[PDB]
Amino acid sequence: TDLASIAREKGIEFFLISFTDLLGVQRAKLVPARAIADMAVNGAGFAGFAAWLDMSPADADILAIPDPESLIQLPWKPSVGWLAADVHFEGRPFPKAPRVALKSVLARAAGKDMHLKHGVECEFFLIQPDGSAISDPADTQAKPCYDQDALMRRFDVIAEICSYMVDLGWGPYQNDHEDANGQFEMNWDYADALVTADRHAFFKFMVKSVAERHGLRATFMPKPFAHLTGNGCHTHLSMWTAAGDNLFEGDGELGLSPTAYAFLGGLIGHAKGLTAVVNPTVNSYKRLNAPVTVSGATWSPNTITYGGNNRTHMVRIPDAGRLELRLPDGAANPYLMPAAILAAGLDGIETQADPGQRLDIDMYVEGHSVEAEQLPLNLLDAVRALEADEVLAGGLGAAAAAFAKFKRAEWADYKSQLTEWERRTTLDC
Amino acid sequence: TDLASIAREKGIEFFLISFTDLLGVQRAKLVPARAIADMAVNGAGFAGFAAWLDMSPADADILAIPDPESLIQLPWKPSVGWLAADVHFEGRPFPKAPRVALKSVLARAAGKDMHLKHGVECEFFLIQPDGSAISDPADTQAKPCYDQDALMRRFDVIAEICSYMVDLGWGPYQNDHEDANGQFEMNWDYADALVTADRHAFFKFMVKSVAERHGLRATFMPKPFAHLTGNGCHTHLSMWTAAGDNLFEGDGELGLSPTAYAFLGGLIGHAKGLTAVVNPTVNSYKRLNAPVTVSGATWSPNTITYGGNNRTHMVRIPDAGRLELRLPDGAANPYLMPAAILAAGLDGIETQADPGQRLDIDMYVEGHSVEAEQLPLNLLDAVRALEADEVLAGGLGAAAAAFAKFKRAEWADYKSQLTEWERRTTLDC
Amino acid sequence: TDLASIAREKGIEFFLISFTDLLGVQRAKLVPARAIADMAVNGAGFAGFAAWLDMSPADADILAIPDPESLIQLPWKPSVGWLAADVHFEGRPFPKAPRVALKSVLARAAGKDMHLKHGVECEFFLIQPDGSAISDPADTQAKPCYDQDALMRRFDVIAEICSYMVDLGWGPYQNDHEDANGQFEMNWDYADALVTADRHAFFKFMVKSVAERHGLRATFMPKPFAHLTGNGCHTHLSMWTAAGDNLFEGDGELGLSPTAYAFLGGLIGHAKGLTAVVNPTVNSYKRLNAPVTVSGATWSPNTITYGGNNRTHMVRIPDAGRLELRLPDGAANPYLMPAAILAAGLDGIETQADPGQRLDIDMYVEGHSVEAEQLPLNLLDAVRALEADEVLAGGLGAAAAAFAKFKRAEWADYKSQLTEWERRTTLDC
Ligand SMILES: Nc1ncnc2c1ncn2[C@@H]1O[C@H](COP(=O)(O)OP(=O)(O)CP(=O)(O)O)[C@@H](O)[C@H]1O
Ligand SMILES: Nc1ncnc2c1ncn2[C@@H]1O[C@H](COP(=O)(O)OP(=O)(O)CP(=O)(O)O)[C@@H](O)[C@H]1O
Ligand SMILES: Nc1ncnc2c1ncn2[C@@H]1O[C@H](COP(=O)(O)OP(=O)(O)CP(=O)(O)O)[C@@H](O)[C@H]1O
């Protein structure tokens, strides 16, 4: 792939050489086309301490080496070409970088002829530019899910993005108004994990950019409104052979194989530590274990459990040959999430983990009359669990410890904030 | 070069005959094409006392003789042609004028077959017209460096200026959102010092003019916001023979030659006086030795030290064959800065100056763990050092004493200003 | 002295056991009469780190032992008795406490039969409660000094305090409107240095308190208004034998003795370090070396010089038998100031210091016509001089080092404040 030739052919005047840091932030440099060949070979230089990579201002620059197969001409601005990149440091891929970490786990699975494919359901809200309320003041009803009126009221922005995804070859197939007022979701086809991760990273940027062009704002925040359903990132998962067979497809219950159940056994066994990574913010813990919403259900997990075609659990089995992890939220890192899921799932397979008993009940109601482990209740406990989880931490490489350091500091920063609630309830102590 | 003929050919209707004064202020006269031939030969008359040149209202006019090879048709207004000029007084170049002062030092070095080449990293903020806040209220995060979102939010202005630089033949190659919210930087190829100095003077005017056309404002202020990273002007330096060999390239530590280390010895040796010139404002001293910023590092020097590929010192060695002086800020005079740097480095070469021990540590966390000289803490102390430095004062000629005079007065003016901080902390003494 | 008996007899219901810290802050504990006997013997406990004493939160409490001879029943609230105290730490007088530091230097002088007596002219402004403007909007003229109208407009507050001083036995004898609009001064009789120091500490508290009772606010700030004269604390000084002979009285010039001139020699010799103590704030340096005021003179020192009956110098000789040190401002510590002056003076006497030639000229218009040493121009330079001054630093003991540490930090805090002036003069650099 000759980026310089493509630039001339396609009318690309600038490239964004982009990488995702440990907090999911999209870091990028805008390089004119005249300079792209040098960047493609040598990488684009960044001072790593200035991003969430856990480095030092005394370190040599990281070099972000773009993956030319990731190229996307911005559909709303085709003269700019976006590239995803691997962060290198001292002549090697830098293990603290999320994309590099995912590729490491992918390579170990590939080594055993197991290829992760996943799809993501990236819920988002459309809100006012100042972020104080949803973008549509006429979207107010108690059960607004799939509301035809409010959906069509945002047809222009939804249709524009959906059409871009058609053009990009992602195979979009549905657009919904989701369960909270102001909340939407646009699905597209699953793919090899690295393809989906790059798409996931690009998708969020695309949605935010387009919303902004329409005088709106998009947020993937886990719990932007106290009494409304939160933003999930439900992740659909299966493992394939290079020959093209889905290893999860089987003759067991619900059409799953023993490999599928073992992979699930790993998700279940490592759930506490996995929460730290797929629920990576303080705010994440207001979506999990949340009080019932105005629409009648939170639709998020409270417990470390799985069901059949049942949306009240940590894991749902929607159909034969795949698992839906409902645990992640909209803040989950597009690269770290698949990486930690894969690490856990692999350990499950390797150890033939038992996921325990499928629960065919509504956990929100018929959950108090059963023994089920509760998810970590806050970021601190989740991070504590990640640190104690040798498989996850080891699986993610140096990314895990750096991630844990940052999230601990975020939690501490959160603790120090004085809230109006404490004042009202404690001033008269 | 026939400016009159060029005017007819290129459709230039007015020329800005411009020179830079001791404070870096761009002084210009707008002359209609009909009058250019006269100005080219004879120079444009200015009352020198009215600019920062340390003259008298009783003096005969200075004559600014334009350098025809410096011609730039304003890319945003091609009917106007900008020219850099040498200030002449009483029939000869005026030593108090920055460009003249630079050319004098360059000629002494050239006499020894040593040709300074440099590049500049001119950081700037984009702010509201009233100067009170950055231009992008959505650019708020603690670590905004290389933020893809904020970068693309200013694509139009950044892309316009980058494309001008392509057309101008400067070889631009990267555009970044820098470490402070609202802060950016656009790099271009190094060149002979005089070429880069003229480009540097033009660039700042270009950035400000274009920002203003977009309803924005650009500032090169060293420290426009108390808790954010400031505007550096990191200067990359090498010395070349007329035959085309880089004298700094060598077999020693980090691919540097003894000549490079001696030049560096001169920078370290004259650092206190050099600080007055490359940090020429009261505000400069709020960038140097600053308390840690929200982003986690100031990225500016505190000490007279150097490192390898390490951004925590006064000098960084980014790669074989050059030095990065991190000392200067956005207020540094585009002509006086290379001038003082060269005077210092030349002396280091002539005396075989020892730069001392390279420090492979983060000076921000380890400044105490070592004996290092601190930079002058304020403009008064810097100017005192400059006045005491015979090599610098001698190297800059009469420019040095005039500059010191002005900067002493600025510091005295600053001292006389009553601050809100003082009233808060002293009213109850 | 039986404070419990005095309490019963005078109707004192509470005592303020007070000590002055290194920044001059009055620290006090309010003790009901039933507990005074205990406090008088054992001392009143305080956590020393919580005041400006350079201690540790891990230190045992300091004990402030009240001087029963210092008792003052607050004239505006006689049921409360104020006591000055010596801070003890671990069973010994605490050398970092100003009053203890002063008593140490007095002891050394007394051991040589030399007893310091001094009087203080404590200028202050009466300002609005919010501190933004003077209290009398009708006080506006260019030369308001001794203005009959404005003086009588504040007759009630001035007369109340003056009558208080009469009753306290301080021998008040004049009340003036001073040279700045809104500025006043009330003089009282000199006394033994420790008496005057205690009186000085109480006086500031009394003026502030009574002003507040009248809906006004008093400030001793050195330079509260940019273009107005500042608050001096002119200190009148003589040295006496126990027998009662003024050692400064003599047959030399102006009725001064060789002892007086040697003491003066100490003041001149140690002036740079002395400045740090008697001009202890950043703001202090806006009073010293200030641009001429609306009234035609600053009345503060610019240079290390002395004159006769002449108010343009650092030292004035008002009459035979005493020296006026015009250096100190309204922020000067009531204890540290006489302590530092005495240490310098004693050294002068010890070494027979030569004060140099008396200058019988106006230094404001004659600064150029003579070779004179300028005073430290800012707090940082003053503190540097203090640390370099062995006699002074040694004479003040550990208080000097603690003071210097604090004042360095204040200067650094000041440096970090972005001023509107910088913005205006630097945004377009
Ligand atoms: N075998 C498989 N492995 C991984 N992902 C798969 C998969 N089969 C389908 N997917 C993906 O999972 C995501 C969701 O698929 P689908 O929409 O059919 O499930 P679901 O109907 O439970 C979602 P919703 O409730 O929003 O309608 C899609 O991106 C889809 O491509
Ligand atoms: N031998 C040399 N002498 C002087 N300047 C040189 C040079 N080689 C490169 N430069 C210049 O130095 C400037 C910076 O170059 P470069 O971008 O490679 O360094 P760097 O990566 O440390 C900058 P940043 O941190 O912003 O990415 C450019 O103007 C470049 O042209
Ligand atoms: N021998 C001495 N030693 C120390 N202080 C003395 C002194 N004799 C007088 N003083 C004191 O000096 C202070 C000022 O004295 P005085 O008012 O006479 O001088 P001055 O007239 O220069 C003051 P102003 O300019 O405000 O009118 C008073 O506190 C006074 O008691």
Numbering used by the authors:
A (entry chain A), B (entry chain B), C (entry chain C): 2 to 430
Give sentences copied directly from the paper behind this entry.
Monomethylamine (MMA) is an important climate-active oceanic trace gas and ubiquitous in the oceans. γ-Glutamylmethylamide synthetase (GmaS) catalyzes the conversion of MMA to γ-glutamylmethylamide, the first step in MMA metabolism in many marine bacteria. The recombinant RhGmaS was active to catalyze the ligation of MMA and glutamate to produce GMA, with ATP and Mg2+ as cofactors. Sequence analysis indicates that GmaS is closely related to, but distinct from, the glutamine synthetase (GS) family, one of the oldest and most ubiquitously existing families of enzymes in biota. However, gel filtration analysis demonstrated that RhGmaS is a dodecamer in solution, which is consistent with the result of electron microscopic analysis.
In the crystal structure of apo-RhGmaS, the electron densities of residues Pro292-Trp300 are rather poor, and we could not place these residues during structural refinement, indicating a relatively high flexibility of this region. However, in the crystal structure of the RhGmaS–AMPPCP complex, the electron densities of this region are clear, and the conformation of the loop Lys287-Ile305 is different from that in the apo-RhGmaS structure, suggesting that the binding of the ATP molecule will lead to the conformation change of the loop Lys287-Ile305. Residues involved in binding ATP are identified based on the crystal structure of the RhGmaS–AMPPCP complex. Trp189 forms a hydrogen bond with the ribose moiety, and residues Glu122, Tyr174, Gln175, Arg312, and Arg317 participate in binding the phosphate moieties of ATP. We noticed that the AMPPCP molecule exhibits two conformations in the RhGmaS–AMPPCP complex, suggesting that the binding of ATP without glutamate and Mg2+ may not be tight. In fact, when we cocrystallized RhGmaS and AMPPCP, we also added Mg2+ in the protein solution, but the fact that no Mg2+ presents in the RhGmaS–AMPPCP complex suggests that Mg2+ is bound after the binding of glutamate. This result indicates that the conformational change of loop Lys287-Ile305 due to ATP binding will facilitate the subsequent binding of glutamate.
